[PDB]
Design a protein around this nucleic acid. Sequence first.
RNA 1: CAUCCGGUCGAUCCUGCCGGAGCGCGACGCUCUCCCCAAGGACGAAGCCAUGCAUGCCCGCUCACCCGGGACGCGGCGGACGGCUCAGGACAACGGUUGCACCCCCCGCGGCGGUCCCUGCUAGCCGGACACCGCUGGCAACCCGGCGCCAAGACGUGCGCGCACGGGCGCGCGCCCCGCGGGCGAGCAGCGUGACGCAGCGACGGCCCGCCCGGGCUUCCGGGGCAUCACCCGGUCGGCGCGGUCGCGGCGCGCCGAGGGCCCGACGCCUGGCGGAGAAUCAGGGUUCGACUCCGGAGAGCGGGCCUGCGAGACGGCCCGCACAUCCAAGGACGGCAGCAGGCGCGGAACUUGCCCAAUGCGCGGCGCGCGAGGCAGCGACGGGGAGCGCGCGAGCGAGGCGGGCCCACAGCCCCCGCCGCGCAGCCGAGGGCAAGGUCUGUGCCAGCAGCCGCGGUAAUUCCAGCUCGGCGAGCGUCGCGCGGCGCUGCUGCAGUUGAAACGCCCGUAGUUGGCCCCCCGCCGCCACGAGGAAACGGGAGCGCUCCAGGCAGGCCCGUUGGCCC
RNA 2: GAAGGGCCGCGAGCCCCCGCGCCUGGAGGAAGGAGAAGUCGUAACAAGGUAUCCGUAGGUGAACCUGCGGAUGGAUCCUU
RNA 3: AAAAUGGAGA
Lengths: 77, 173, 140, 176, 260
Amino acid sequence: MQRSIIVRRDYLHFVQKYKRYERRHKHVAAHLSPCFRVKEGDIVTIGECRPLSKTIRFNVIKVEPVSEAAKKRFSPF
Amino acid sequence: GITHDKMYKRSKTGAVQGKWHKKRKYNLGRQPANTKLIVKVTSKKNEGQKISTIRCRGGNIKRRALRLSHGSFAWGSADISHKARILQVVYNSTSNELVRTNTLVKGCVVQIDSAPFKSALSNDTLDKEILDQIRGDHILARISSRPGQVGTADGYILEGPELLFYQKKLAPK
Amino acid sequence: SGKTSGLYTARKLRTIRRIQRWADKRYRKAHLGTWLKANPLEGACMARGIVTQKIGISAKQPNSAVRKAVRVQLTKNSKKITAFVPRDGSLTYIDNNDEVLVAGFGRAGRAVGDIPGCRFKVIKVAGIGLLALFLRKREK
Amino acid sequence: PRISRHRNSSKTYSTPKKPFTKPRLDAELKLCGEYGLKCKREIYRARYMLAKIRRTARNLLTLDENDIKRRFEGAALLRRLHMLGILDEEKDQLDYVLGLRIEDIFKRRLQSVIVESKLAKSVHHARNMIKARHISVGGQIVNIPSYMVRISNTSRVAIADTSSLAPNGKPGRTKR
Amino acid sequence: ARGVRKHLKRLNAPKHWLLDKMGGIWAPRPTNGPHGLRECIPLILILRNRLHYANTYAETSMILQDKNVLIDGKPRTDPTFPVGFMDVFEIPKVHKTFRVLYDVKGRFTLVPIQSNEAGFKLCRVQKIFLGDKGMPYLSTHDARTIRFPHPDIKTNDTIKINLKTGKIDEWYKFDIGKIVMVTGGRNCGRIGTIQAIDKHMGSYTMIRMKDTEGTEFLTRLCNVFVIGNDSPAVAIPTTKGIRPDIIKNRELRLRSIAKR
RNA sequence: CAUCCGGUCGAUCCUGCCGGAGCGCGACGCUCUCCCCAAGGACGAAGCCAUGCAUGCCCGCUCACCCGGGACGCGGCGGACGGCUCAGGACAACGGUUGCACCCCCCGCGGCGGUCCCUGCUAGCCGGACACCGCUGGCAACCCGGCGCCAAGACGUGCGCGCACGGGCGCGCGCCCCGCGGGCGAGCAGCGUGACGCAGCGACGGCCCGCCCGGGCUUCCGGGGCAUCACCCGGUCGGCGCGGUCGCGGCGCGCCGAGGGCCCGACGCCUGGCGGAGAAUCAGGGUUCGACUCCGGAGAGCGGGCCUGCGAGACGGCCCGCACAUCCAAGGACGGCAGCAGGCGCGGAACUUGCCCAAUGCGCGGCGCGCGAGGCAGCGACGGGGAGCGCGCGAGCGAGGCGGGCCCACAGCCCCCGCCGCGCAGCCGAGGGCAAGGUCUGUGCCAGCAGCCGCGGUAAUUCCAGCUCGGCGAGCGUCGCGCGGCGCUGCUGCAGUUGAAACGCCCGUAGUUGGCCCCCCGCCGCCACGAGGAAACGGGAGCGCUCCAGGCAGGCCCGUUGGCCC
RNA sequence: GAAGGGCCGCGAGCCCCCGCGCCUGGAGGAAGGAGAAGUCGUAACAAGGUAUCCGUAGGUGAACCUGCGGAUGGAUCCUU
RNA sequence: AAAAUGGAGA
């Protein structure tokens, strides 16, 4: 997307009936700027902001690229 | 009212949400204003520059771009300003159709008259490109004020490599 | 049973419970939603209506006598269902079309005891209780 | 919002889990004669009050002593039970509630005190005497049979002036 | 829905107003004013119930209007008069004046007050906000906002009032450990001093308060109402912030039940 | 709060489900001497409404063939509050967590309260101009015809301090990070400069900013079923401008780039789908329901649009489309009860075309009125909580009659007093589970009984009656329901060699699961553990209504209460 | 500056083709189920008289029979 | 070699 990245957070939900968890995930969109270009597999913080657009409400700040391929592992950071 | 609600728009995933209720007055929308600029009053006197104040939530009063032709410009370099009636709308940039009806738009590049700004030639060569525009009585500028919401025709003068970028289009393209 | 047990397996167990819940005849009875539409009674204790042709259903075994019942069309769903009469010789009171309320046989669907093929049981005729008509407690 | 309808309702009468059991059935009639209960709903009403008094103690026993929820509630449990007298004030024990007697709740009932103190000398006589307004607690006449008096004020039970104690001058039909 | 509303049922009453759930078709909502909705206990109960000076709310209606109570010189006919902590309810006829302090049980209770105490009422301040074309102003916890405040003070300063012109009595400044009196959560009528500031570049500042009982507890600084630069400086409730516990409450009533 | 037992047979030991047995809610039926507190057209009809009422209050301005009581209107404010029903609505409504430096607001409340004037000026007070009325118009009504005067705490013109001061502009900090103060967590506000410009109010000068307040978005975590719905969206999805709104925004309108979201189930479809606080029944663990108090959301036959206002797309506002009405004199008009009664319709079923502002709150208003909100009574086996029909050998009462007292907007009721006192019961069974006659009468596998398992084929413990008697009881039973039973839905905690059940076989991608192992670091998850999280209700202080059920009162009183856990 | 007209901005509804989705009416076919005593044979259960039975084809009044590969739940746990 | 029934319901 032009100047836009879709970041996926993962939430582990405790269900009571069975104390095992579900790895439900959410993909949220923000606004990156060419000042901090992003690689695939990076840790990207999104700041609660003014409602930018129909889906846009967040904005990227810190980018930490991980080496090789980061895959998923459902890691919430 | 012609509402502006999220429910009316489709969800990002393509869901068409049925609206929970009917449309709301605080979400109301209004008539887009088509501004009227007079090249010359000449023989006809039926049209004059009139501005509209409208009812709003909270009693707030909104001046509107009913009929505005007189225009004001402050030289960024000088910080002094002069007020007259601008020639017309020249570079709406959104649409070239808007230009034909002289519908004013916030910060749309226009054609600027120099009836009180011809005084610039007295200072020695200030903004020689502006000096060449001022004597001619035709200049480029963006009326940077909100016409529909606040009924304002005050605007900045175009100076800077930004004026040159627009000028390259304004001259043959 | 294999069983899938892990700290992150609330998915297998959630789907399995939902799918394998509807296996019981009783569970499906109340959870398919067919039973409210399918039952002649719309899931109610009693239903008013008008009486139609009377009926003499042969019993099975051991019971070996005809048990007089009346088939009545319930007004609400416009459907005709038979209702077993109450105590000894209580059918003579019921003849032509008359206001009849019908109630469950306890089982709620299965035919009661050993009288075959009857799902419902009449409880009233006209405006007086049919178990009072039998005792002459309340009768025309 | 229909403000006068707002209220609460209670279920003192709780029936047991299997009704026709010979031991439970026999004890019912046996108890009914012992304390002179007119209805069998009341014995179950007693069972419900007894259970609440039994659970509070079991949960309290499983808490360690002086645990604030335990300490305040324990003293509370003793205070109400000691007032009743079913728990001897001397016992003074949160655990002492366990092993409780249904007969003791029945003993607390004022109808019982009248028979014991020979005020009427019979449970059948006692209910009839209370029906005819003949026993007053601290002088407050009560015609409902189960006044239920705390032991702390058991010594204040009294008879009635209308026709039992020092006749006021109203001997039922005999007066006229 | 639609526009703003002005009614309250007798369950929506904040459970700290301790107005009875029974004996109420609809709760007394307080009209907006110097004091916000949750905080002010409607003045109908202050005269009709606590004082028991009015048999009914109609009796509160009969005399409140004719200058019977004057905090900063005002009575009003409304029994919804807005009030709060350190507000000097003043009655000339009762031959007494009083300040409503938060009782430990979470209901503001009137403490009979001396005339020197009648002279001063206290409202907290937040951060100076420019008002009147940049002519300075100070945001306040109760609605008394004023122009031209003390120029050097910057944030969270408690302020007292003379009750007439009521110019700021004192610009108390926190020195950390300064005698503080937060009134929120379980801090109702509780006295102490502050300890740790956790603004944390985040919302809601956690300030720990060491107390005379010995408790140090962090809380929103929003409910701060400092009592004195040092010492209470204004008489505190009969508890004095000591805060009683349920076990004693049974006994205090138990002796009282026997005593009556 | 950790449970059974009747049933496959000749018997046994099973699995397995059927049935009782417990418990709540409504019907229904059989029935009531009580007394007290009480739900009440939620249930494929958010179907239609006849008949009344349901937001009204003060005349600044009164000159009205009056009086000190003032009509009327102009105005002022309220009818955006409430009451009701959950139709619609499935990343919505909804609970809690963020922020609004993307934002409006009336009441009240604390500050401010300079307002150039071009013009006209009376600036110690200027206008002309409407109702009420006066007079005379129509119609079948509805509906409101002209004219004539005439006032405002009505409406309008306008005086007043160019550091006028309305917005909105145009324009002016920085100097690689960070601190300073009117500042925040955040360079945000404000000021200055330049151009406009006409907001104040003001003809009894109140504009402005705060605080509260009720909104308006918004961030996270939650927020029905169906895969005999697998690929879906096409303003769809990101930017780039712009319009529009209180406002951010695809919200719209242009311009582009191809995006979005998905087996962790997208999109679609269905729902006798309002969500939650809650409710039911249970050891734990659950399961089930949430329409009714309260809390938020919606909606007033149905779709749209619009006004008035500070806020409504209001519906006892309007105007149109669509149905269905009503008057209708044929020319017209004029509705809206999912407000309270009350009908019609409908069903198994669901209260007075009552009284009514005294309270309880809310409107207008210091010298009181309204509110079919509510209050009150009526009805009412929804349901509860507590009595009786004797005890005894005498004499005792409580259901009542009459009067008193008391009580109550008014009456009632418990109560309090006396003469008197008219004590009075049901509905289920009796072979087993499941308690209680192989009594005595009809009786012929006939009638019938019969939850269940089973009885009646001519000598019934099983029916049909009268005996008796067991249970429960002014409430007993019959049904449909939810929970427990049922570890028969299984996470705890089930089976699959033969009862019901391992794919015929192997690879394989997501999905699930990966041995030891690096003490100390940082994130995960994770517990301890706070802050701040509305109640009602429930757990639960204290408290004797004639005892509780109840309620939060009470008395010389913890500042007496109503603690505390939610 | 009204009654109007116009250019239009919204906008219910309509109409005309469809793409769905829910509900229903049918002459008649074609099944399933139930009740002490109907018929025609008698398949299987004893090696039930041809041991069964499964898959698959072929016939067949009616169950059934037959062909070919299996399994014993077989009547064989057992001779180089 | 053939070799088929055995009403219902205690």
